DNA sequence: CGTTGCGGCAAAGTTATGGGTAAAGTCACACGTAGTCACCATAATGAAATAAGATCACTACTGGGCAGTACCAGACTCGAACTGATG
């Protein structure tokens, strides 16, 4: 489940507006770039994208150590 | 005439460069990045205070009028008496 948090942050999560991925070094980060004020998604939206995500795009991706969906 | 060195011609040989494809590596998922003093100008009262203003009290200076007094007649009114007409 711990490495398809990592699928999920890959596929899904890191090509979404606010992703906090420059706030890992904290130094680099601007308030030009600081996610707050980048931020658009809701709850509801994400919540419905993550599942569509889980339920056919992993669903169907065949895997490495099953040679199937 | 034959031999020998030299040079053109055209594959052939060697590097280089931008493509494709399987396969060895690479690295984040492991709860976490936002969070916190320091900074000096402006509004904004509320208090401190004003600088002049307001009034009291006293001192001195200078206009200035009222209750009362007084005379010299002119003029109207009328006691008191005189005098003439009369029934």
């Known amino acids: 489940c711990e490495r ?4 999920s942050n890959t596929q899904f999560v890191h090509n ?5 991925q420059i706030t890992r070094n904290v130094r680099q980060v601007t308030k030009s770039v600081n996610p707050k004020n980048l931020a658009v998604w809701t709850l509801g939206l994400l919540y419905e994208y993550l599942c569509a995500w889980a339920y056919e795009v992993y669903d169907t991706d065949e895997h ?3 040679f199937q969906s």
């Not at 398809?4 to 699928?7: A, H, N, V, Y």
């Not at 979404?16 to 906090?20: M, P, R």
């Open 4 to 7: 398809l948090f990592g699928t």
């Open 16 to 20: 979404l507006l606010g992703n906090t």
């Open 64 to 66: 490495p150590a099953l």
